[PDB]
Design an enzyme around this catalytic site. Structure first.
Site, mmCIF file in Angstrom:
data_model
loop_
_atom_site.group_PDB
_atom_site.id
_atom_site.type_symbol
_atom_site.label_atom_id
_atom_site.label_comp_id
_atom_site.label_asym_id
_atom_site.label_seq_id
_atom_site.Cartn_x
_atom_site.Cartn_y
_atom_site.Cartn_z
ATOM 1 N N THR E 1 -11.416 -6.868 -10.289
ATOM 2 C CA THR E 1 -12.298 -7.876 -10.955
ATOM 3 C C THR E 1 -13.385 -8.185 -9.933
ATOM 4 O OG1 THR E 1 -10.746 -8.899 -12.504
ATOM 5 C CG2 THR E 1 -12.404 -10.358 -11.563
HETATM 6 C C1 LIG Z 1 -9.470 -9.390 -12.470
HETATM 7 O O1 LIG Z 1 -9.129 -10.395 -11.846
HETATM 8 C C2 LIG Z 1 -8.530 -8.652 -13.204
HETATM 9 C C3 LIG Z 1 -8.963 -8.436 -14.685
HETATM 10 O O2 LIG Z 1 -8.105 -7.443 -15.268
HETATM 11 C C4 LIG Z 1 -8.870 -9.679 -15.613
HETATM 12 C C5 LIG Z 1 -9.518 -9.305 -16.958
HETATM 13 C C6 LIG Z 1 -9.557 -10.957 -15.088
HETATM 14 N N1 LIG Z 1 -7.208 -9.301 -13.120
HETATM 15 C C7 LIG Z 1 -6.286 -8.382 -12.831
HETATM 16 O O3 LIG Z 1 -5.093 -8.652 -12.709
HETATM 17 C C8 LIG Z 1 -6.809 -7.083 -12.745
HETATM 18 C C9 LIG Z 1 -6.139 -6.245 -11.639
HETATM 19 C C10 LIG Z 1 -8.298 -7.316 -12.498
HETATM 20 O O4 LIG Z 1 -8.572 -7.446 -11.083
#
Ligand SMILES: *C(=O)[C@]1([C@@H](O)C(C)C)NC(=O)[C@H](C)[C@@H]1O
Ligand SMILES: *C(=O)[C@]1([C@@H](O)C(C)C)NC(=O)[C@H](C)[C@@H]1O
Ligand SMILES: *C(=O)[C@]1([C@@H](O)C(C)C)NC(=O)[C@H](C)[C@@H]1O
Ligand SMILES: *C(=O)[C@]1([C@@H](O)C(C)C)NC(=O)[C@H](C)[C@@H]1O
Ligand SMILES: [Cl-]
Ligand SMILES: [Cl-]
Ligand SMILES: [Mg+2]
Ligand SMILES: [Mg+2]
Ligand SMILES: [Mg+2]
Ligand SMILES: [Mg+2]
Ligand SMILES: [Mg+2]
Lengths: 222, 212, 204, 195, 196, 233, 226, 195, 196
Positions: E1
């Site tokens: 993210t």
């Molecule tokens: C980002 O933080 C993230 C995204 O998939 C969501 C949509 C916010 N969170 C996660 O756990 C994954 C690994 C991404 O980094």
């Protein structure tokens, strides 16, 4: 994982005389290999000619002493300013400790004073409330170093009378307040030499019919 | 810890040691392992010291309330069951208790109830509880008879604790003797194991293995 | 589980004026069960005395080993081994088992035959030497012994006075330990005479 | 296996050993002899982990029998016990240690004295007037402490042994199916067929 | 993210990638991580998608009810409501939220709320797995009182690098501009930002 | 039960003849990441007390709000709120100490180590410690975290016991504190150069110093050090 | 354990406290932690006490044989290289943490060695449980171009910081000064700031206090003639 | 506790239960009666975890005795067994379940038939001609399968029960100190004092 | 640990911080992580200090023996010897080594050897805990065929940021320049690089 307990070290010692009682304790407070304070009072005057110390985990020790002092105050309110006898104080402390049977006050408690006949009294508690009147009791870190010495020099254990060769025991003569203080000081001097958590200062509270008196002595600071 | 209690012609003998240990460290040699519940009831200490002191002192309060309400001495059966029902509520929490509730009433006669922190409640003639129980059982079983005298019964209980005190590392200090009659218990003194061992060795001819 | 506290027992050694003293209890146990009241923990090779606490099978094994080694020493050197030299031999022998050690707490005591100087020493299980002037302690009641020795001891005690001090140090320490006691022995050692005394103590 | 006892009297050594062999939920046998004759005047009883016990006992037996032939001489009980201790002391730091506890009862023909040695699996040797392994001592030592005398006869020793077995049969949870008793004296080793 | 918010002369701009991953599988390559809690108070979401959505939905509810009673809330007020939820439920939440908003009185403000539930008012904020790779770049290249075009370039270049190195980040670079003029959405595709 | 996320490092303090000094750096770490560089960890309460906090920052901000709320509450129906019935250091500490021990007793602690420094009504110096376990102690010098290991030794050379306090001036005390902060910057991997310092004097009152920096650092000797043993070039 | 090493004008000095501990119990109150590898190469040890003693004797022995083989006085880099390679081979299991110092024909040297085999170079170093207390003093008072007298003062002050503030350290201060073109001087018990005060009472017992069962003469002498 | 058996013959139900109470290393008692009379013609034996067994048995006893007074009527064995099963079925999903296995032997006065019900701690009820709990069935079921007939007399049932106990005494490792035997028939409940 | 090697027109420059940490305690604040395996073949060390020293000492031995027999070794050869040790002993080693050297034929070359034991020839390489924070910066700011002064500035600015954000990195910035002219050591103190 969070660990709600800790070890603040320290060592305490209570000795009951014929018409007096002493409760001593070193003034060093520690965590692991660090010194927190070289003078942190551990033995407290709780009123009604009772002295108390709760050695071990200092947070639980302070909490308990605070609650007992509070119990003395409310005993006066509820029972027409009646003096709380040492035996009654001992039973009350049992209920305070056992009240947390399944999440104990991690301390070894000792109180001292005079019984209702004016004789010297010392009571000793485990963490969960089991208590007992005793003539002699060391508690805390260097308790294993001190108690054997007290068995020998206070109760004259394993000592016999010359010439008889094991047949006649050394008579259990009464010790004066000056004689007891000497044994307390030598106990803590010896404990300081061989135990790393013991040192800095020694504070003794002496209880007589006249009241509570204090004496302080220096200990090695290494 | 070595505690025993047995029924006989002259009532009940209760005998206990005095040692308290935290690991290998001998915390006390002068522990009182007999609780004087009231002038007619006794209880023994094994396992948890606080649990015993707290709840059997509490038991004494319940027995006092019973005889105030019912104008009659509480039975040994009822007193033991009050304690066993209590510890059963706490089952799982980690109470540690092994006790003989000993008493002598009109309707029951001399009675002993073994009460346990697992909720066990057993009536019986002979009981031994503690780390040195097996040693005490040996002396008891080979020498016990219903028609023992009060003098011989007291000695048997004393000697059986001594047997355990010697062999069991976690038992010793001194021996406390009680004799329970219908008019109440009678204390029969504190006996240092150090002095008692040599006295018994000489007078009895026992412990030939040990040099004295 | 812990090998150093299965069998139990203690040894203590002290120095005096022109003399040394070494003492031990007599208990051997299997944890709570007392097995033997005649298990001596002090041995000697010539005029050099060795006390050993800890796991009993190793106590026996090491005694047999040092008897073995001091006997060969004597045949080759044409003289009895000295306390200072023996101390180094104990240290070497323990450290060669660095990653599979004997679970013991040895204590050396004796008087140097040439210089007449009193000598005592202690070791951990792995061979580290503790060469103290005053006293050495070892065993399951070592804490108790440290407390007794530290208060009771004073330097330059005469043999018959030293006997009383070390005896009272051992007895009262053992009485505060569940796995020690069941009798005791004290060796008083002078340059050319050695007295061995069995002590009367509580048998619980 | 379970219970093994030993008692040294005036002129002999008596060894008592249980007959039961229990494998899990069933008692497969009730007549098992947990002992081996090492030499004409030396008997060893044993108890411990299955397989290891017999394997160890027979291994010791073979070694002592080999010594006897080579030197045309019987080793003293003390000598045999020291040999046995060393083997166990060697064993405890092995890849897979022998889990065996033993009692060695022997009559020394040179000194004209009975001798009882107790050795555990760690190699912990002790000479005793009476001994046991496992939980056996926990019941019987109090009786032995009380009644034992060094000048007892063989018949008196057997009576004290019966009292020990009776106490075991009363207070032990396990049914060990009685004991086989053997006596070691100047004339050698014999079995008491009625007990 | 990869998410960030940057204050500038005219207000504040929120920026984010569009990748949502379950392990190494990209569950959604066109995700909208820039979400609205009030007309001119938005937030960037990182951590648990379920947690951050649930939190954002609750905040939006709180600010909607706040507005009905007391009029438009401050950006500080919105950040406080986020904090209260994140702090008091720290044991059961995995949420790293950047709050950004525009008042007329206070102008552009940025508050970052990391895992613990603490609040930190900053000139600009970066967060998410991909932020680690651009601490150096962002520190060296950020200036206060930038123009709209400069701030868009700063965010575009920053997230471009975060996307380049972080496997958990990718897709399109979404942005939301908050000024007095209103609310403007911007999108930038791989072919544009990769060649930077 | 939790784990600390954003954390603050050492707080150091000592008594001197007329009052107390307390200091703490301006860093909020996120594990090994030195995330936030403008965090104030000394929080004054009134004009006579300064509370220095280390450990979890989110819990620090909670404690900060409790103290702010405490001042408000003390003012309610209190004509002497800015005089005889003002908040004392001893009152503020005992409150926190109560909270810390209660929270550890519910197995949900405020993951902090706190030093309350101040001056009482009668001019007496107040300096006492409390942490996540509810453990409390007082001493002429007090320090948290790495400060306990490195700062205290240096500060104890100035004030070794109670009798050394009247002999210690504010200039000597401040010098020792500033030197200690330099040592912590050399040796604590979770520290920063920027810090805040607060002096509470019975005569001159509360002096709060922001944006201080560690200076007079010795690094020149590094140029001579080469390799890890045998290397000469 | 507090051990330090300090470089100065014409050499190097090392120092150490004298407390050895088993858990919270003090085993020896006057322990010797300064070890001799060769006449002018000494080192101070922390961690597993047997390991530090053993590893310095082994390397010291091999260093002596090497010195005889090469007809040259031993070098500190040789002791350093031999120690690290030995400690690396045992992957940290030999728990020896050493400060190695000395003078040789190359000059004066000061190194530290960790149990896993890593080595460091420095002008001032400290190791052990009291290293943080000691390093605080070193960081506060160290400067370039220290004299012999200044370096001894600084080294012993750093040990004192450990003695007083660290519970793992105590008793006395041992020092060893190694100056170029001179014999290394080993100052055993350089400071003695922890003498026990006279006891309140004498505990000398009256003769015949202890109960005795048996007495006997032990034969320590050999088998006799005639 | 250990071994509890049950056998339904022509005109009665016979329950056999061990006398031993073992706590750890010692046999504290050798005369323990592991049964409670629920009603004049219904007997329940029990075995399981210490404390829970007696507490459960007495709790059931009190409830049935309460029902008897209220309605001035004795519940059928089937009715009592269903009540007991529900209590155990309720118990198994509790905070701390009753760890108790029971046999309910009763004589139905309405149908003039003996009835034996086996219920485990989970609340698993089965009506059987003969039953057991724990490891007891492992030894005795082969003998019961072979010899059992539905038209057996009470004396024949006791003889088959002796053969079961003998097999247990031979092959079980634990010494259960014999059994107390009780018979339930049209006339009520009585104890066989010699067995 | 912040370490990097950068090729440029005249050769190659190795750069490193000077911090060594045991947990949060800085065991050594003036460490030399730039170490010599041959006259003009050096390496940057990250990971286990014991492992990387032991490896480097062995490599130096191998290249010293190589030189005695076959003359000066190539930088590729040195990297291969590092790889062989790191790959074959991957289960027992924690070593991340950057190898940098100067030939006259091949000029400046940089090889990076991460945990696995793989080899990667690159124009420049970054490694150590502090490298994570400068992937963005270094990618945006690196150019091929830079001058000596430009490359020194690039390394100085890069490691400055790595030190700023990484607690495990700090102290002085050491550098070693490898060209035809010879071997030049450089040092840069906190007061210099912090204000960048
Ligand atoms: C980002 O933080 C993230 C995204 O998939 C969501 C949509 C916010 N969170 C996660 O756990 C994954 C690994 C991404 O980094
Ligand atoms: C005995 O039961 C015992 C005594 O210490 C107390 C005082 C009753 N309890 C124990 O836990 C230990 C093991 C002792 O045997
Ligand atoms: C010091 O390192 C230390 C000393 O006891 C020995 C004598 C070097 N080693 C230890 O293990 C203990 C804890 C001391 O710190
Ligand atoms: C760097 O990798 C580092 C340095 O201490 C050594 C000197 C290479 N290794 C580590 O383990 C620590 C944490 C540093 O990052
Ligand atoms: Cl989402
Ligand atoms: Cl390194
Ligand atoms: Mg001390
Ligand atoms: Mg004892
Ligand atoms: Mg005993
Ligand atoms: Mg044995
Ligand atoms: Mg840094």
């Amino acid at each position: 994982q969070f660990n709600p307990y800790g070890d603040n070290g320290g060592t305490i010692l209570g000795i009951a005389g014929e018409d007096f009682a002493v409760l001593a304790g070193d003034t060093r407070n520690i965590t692991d290999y660090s010194i927190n304070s070289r003078y942190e009072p551990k033995v407290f005057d709780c009123g009604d000619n009772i002295v108390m110390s709760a050695n071990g985990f200092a947070a639980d020790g302070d909490a308990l002493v605070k609650r007992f002092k509070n119990s003395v105050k409310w005993y006066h309110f509820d029972h027409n300013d009646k003096k709380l006898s040492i035996n009654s104080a001992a039973r009350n402390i049992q209920h305070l400790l056992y009240g947390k049977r399944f999440f104990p006050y991690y301390v070894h408690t000792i109180i001292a004073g005079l019984d209702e006949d004016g004789k010297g009294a010392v009571y000793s508690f485990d963490p969960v409330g089991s208590y007992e009147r005793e003539q002699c009791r060391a508690g805390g870190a260097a308790a294993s170093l001190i108690m054997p010495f007290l068995d020998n020099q206070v109760n004259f254990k394993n000592q016999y009378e010359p010439g008889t060769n094991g047949k006649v025991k050394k008579p259990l003569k009464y010790l004066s307040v000056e004689e007891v203080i000497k044994l307390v000081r030598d106990s803590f001097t010896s404990a300081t030499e061989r135990h790393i958590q013991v040192g800095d200062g020694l504070e003794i509270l002496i209880v007589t019919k006249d009241g509570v008196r204090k004496e302080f002595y220096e200990l090695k600071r290494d | 810890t070595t505690t025993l209690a047995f029924r006989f012609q002259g009532g009940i003998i209760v005998a206990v040691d005095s040692r308290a240990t935290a690991g290998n460290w001998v915390a006390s040699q002068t522990v009182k392992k007999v609780i004087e519940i009231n002038p007619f009831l006794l209880g023994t200490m094994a396992g948890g010291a606080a649990d015993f002191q707290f709840w059997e002192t509490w038991l004494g309060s319940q027995c006092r309330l019973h005889e105030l309400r019912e104008k009659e001495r509480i039975s040994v059966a009822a007193a033991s069951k009050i304690l066993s029902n209590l510890v059963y509520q706490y089952k799982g929490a980690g109470l540690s208790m092994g006790t003989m509730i000993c008493g002598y009433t009109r309707k029951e006669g001399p009675t002993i109830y073994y009460v346990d922190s697992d909720g066990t409640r057993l009536k019986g003639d002979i009981f031994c509880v503690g780390s040195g129980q097996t040693f005490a059982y040996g002396v008891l079983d080979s020498n016990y008879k219903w028609d023992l005298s009060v003098e011989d019964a007291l000695y048997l209980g004393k000697r059986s604790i001594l047997a355990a005190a010697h062999r069991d590392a976690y038992s010793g200090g001194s021996v406390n003797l009680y004799h329970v009659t219908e008019d109440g218990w009678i204390y029969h003194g504190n006996h240092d194991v150090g002095e008692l061992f040599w006295k018994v060795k000489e007078e009895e001819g026992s412990f030939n293995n040990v040099i004295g | 589980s812990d090998p150093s506290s299965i069998n139990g027992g203690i040894v203590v050694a002290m120095t005096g004026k022109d003399c040394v003293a070494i003492a031990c209890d007599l208990r051997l146990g299997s944890q709570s069960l007392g097995v033997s009241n005649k298990f001596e923990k002090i041995f000697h090779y010539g005029h050099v005395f060795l006390g050993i606490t800890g796991l009993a099978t190793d106590v026996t094994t090491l005694n047999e080993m040092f008897r073995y080694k001091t006997n060969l020493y004597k045949l080759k050197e044409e003289r009895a081994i000295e306390p200072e030299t023996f101390t180094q031999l104990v240290s070497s022998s323990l450290y060669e088992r660095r990653f599979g050690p004997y679970f013991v707490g040895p204590v050396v005591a004796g008087i140097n035959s040439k210089s007449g100087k009193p000598f005592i020493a202690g070791f951990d299980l792995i061979g580290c030497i503790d060469e103290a002037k005053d006293f050495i302690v070892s065993g399951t009641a070592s804490d108790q012994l440290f407390g007794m020795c530290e208060s009771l001891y004073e330097p330059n005690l005469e043999p018959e006075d030293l006997f009383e001090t070390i005896s009272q140090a051992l007895l009262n320490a053992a009485d505060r330990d569940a796995l020690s006691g069941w009798g005791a022995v004290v060796y008083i050692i002078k340059k050319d005479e050695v007295v061995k005394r069995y002590l009367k103590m509580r048998q619980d | 296996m379970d219970i093994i006892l030993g008692i040294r009297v005036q002129d002999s050594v008596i060894l008592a050993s249980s007959k039961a062999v229990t494998r899990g939920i069933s008692v497969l046998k009730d007549s098992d002899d947990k002992t081996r004759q090492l030499s004409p005047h030396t008997l060893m009883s044993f108890a411990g982990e299955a397989g290891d016990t017999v394997q160890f006992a027979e291994y010791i037996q073979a070694n002592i029998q080999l010594y006897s032939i080579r030197e045309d001489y019987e080793l003293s009980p003390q000598a045999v016990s020291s040999f046995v201790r060393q083997e166990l002391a060697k064993s405890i730091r092995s890849r897979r240690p022998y889990q065996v506890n033993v009692l060695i009862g022997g009559y020394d023909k040179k000194k004209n004295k009975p001798e009882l040695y107790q050795i555990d699996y760690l190699g912990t040797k002790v000479e005793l007037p009476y001994g046991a392994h496992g939980y056996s001592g926990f019941y019987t030592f109090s009786l032995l402490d009380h009644h034992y005398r060094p000048d007892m006869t063989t018949e008196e020793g057997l009576d004290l042994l019966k009292l020990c077995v009776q106490e075991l049969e009363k207070r032990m949870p396990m049914d060990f199916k009685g004991v086989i008793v053997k006596i070691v004296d100047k004339d050698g080793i014999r079995q008491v067929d009625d007990f | 993210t990869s998410i960030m918010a940057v204050t500038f002369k005219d207000g504040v701009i929120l920026g984010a990638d569009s990748r949502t991953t379950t392990g190494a599988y990209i569950a959604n390559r066109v995700t909208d991580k820039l979400t609205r809690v009030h007309d001119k108070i938005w937030c960037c979401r990182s951590g648990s998608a379920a947690d951050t959505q649930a939190i954002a939905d609750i905040v939006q509810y709180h600010l909607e009810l706040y507005t009905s009673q007391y009029g438009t809330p401050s950006t500080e007020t919105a950040a406080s409501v986020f904090k209260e939820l994140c702090y008091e439920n720290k044991d059961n939440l995995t949420a790293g939220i950047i709050v950004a908003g525009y008042d007329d009185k206070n102008k552009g403000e940025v508050y970052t709320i990391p895992l613990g539930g603490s609040v930190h008012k900053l000139p600009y904020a970066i967060a998410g797995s991909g932020s680690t790779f651009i601490y150096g770049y962002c520190d060296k290249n950020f200036r206060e009182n930038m123009s709209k075009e400069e701030t868009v370039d700063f965010i575009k270049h920053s997230l471009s690098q975060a996307i380049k190195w972080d496997g958990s980040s990718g897709g399109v670079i979404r942005m939301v501009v908050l000024t007095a003029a209103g609310v403007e959405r911007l999108i930038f595709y791989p072919d544009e930002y990769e060649q930077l | 039960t939790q784990q600390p996320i954003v954390t603050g490092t050492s707080v150091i303090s000592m008594k001197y003849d007329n009052g107390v000094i307390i200091a703490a750096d301006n860093l909020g770490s996120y594990g090994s990441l030195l995330r936030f560089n403008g965090v104030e960890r000394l929080i004054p309460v009134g004009d006579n007390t300064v509370v220095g906090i280390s450990g979890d920052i989110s819990d620090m901000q909670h404690i900060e709000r409790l103290l702010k709320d405490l001042v408000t509450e003390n003012a309610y129906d209190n004509p002497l709120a800015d005089a005889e019935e003002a908040l004392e250091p001893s009152y503020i500490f005992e409150y926190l100490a109560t909270v810390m021990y209660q929270r550890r007793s519910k197995m949900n602690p405020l993951w902090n180590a706190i030093i309350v420094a101040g001056v009482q009504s009668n001019g007496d110096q107040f300096l006492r410690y409390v942490n996540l376990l509810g453990v409390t102690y007082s001493s002429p010098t007090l320090a948290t975290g790495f400060g306990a290991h490195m700062a205290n030794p240096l500060l104890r050379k100035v004030v070794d016991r109670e009798s050394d306090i009247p002999k210690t001036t504010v200039q000597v005390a401040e010098e020792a504190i500033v030197n200690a902060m330099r040592v912590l910057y050399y040796r604590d991997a979770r520290s920063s150069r920027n810090f805040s310092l607060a002096i509470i004097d019975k005569n001159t009152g509360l002096t709060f110093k922001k944006n201080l920096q560690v200076e007079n650092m010795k690094w020149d000797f590094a140029k001579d050090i080469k390799g890890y043993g045998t290397q000469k070039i | 354990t507090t051990i330090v090493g300090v470089k100065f004008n014409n050499g190097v000095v090392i120092a150490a406290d004298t407390r050895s501990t088993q858990g919270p119990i003090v085993a020896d109150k006057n322990c010797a932690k300064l070890h001799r590898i060769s006449p002018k190469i000494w080192c101070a040890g922390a961690g597993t006490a047997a390991d530090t003693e053993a590893v310095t004797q082994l390397i010291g022995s091999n260093i002596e044989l090497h010195s005889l083989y090469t007809s040259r006085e031993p070098r500190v880099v040789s002791a350093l290289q031999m120690l690290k390679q030995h400690l690396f081979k045992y992957q940290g299991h030999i728990g020896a943490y050493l400060i190695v110092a000395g003078v040789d024909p190359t000059g004066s040297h000061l190194f530290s060695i960790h149990a896993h085999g890593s080595t460091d170079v420095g002008y001032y170093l400290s190791l052990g449980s009291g290293s943080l207390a000691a390093m605080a003093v070193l960081e506060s008072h160290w400067k370039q171009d220290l004299t012999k007298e200044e370096a001894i003062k600084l080294a012993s002050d750093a040990i004192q910081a450990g003695i007083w503030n660290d519970l793992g350290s105590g008793s006395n201060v041992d020092v060893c000064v190694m100056e170029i073109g001179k014999d290394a001087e080993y100052l055993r018990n350089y400071l003695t700031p922890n003498v026990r005060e006279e006891k309140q009472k004498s505990y000398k017992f009256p003769r015949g206090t202890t109960a005795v069962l048996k007495e006997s003469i032990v034969n320590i002498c050999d088998i006799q003639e005639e």
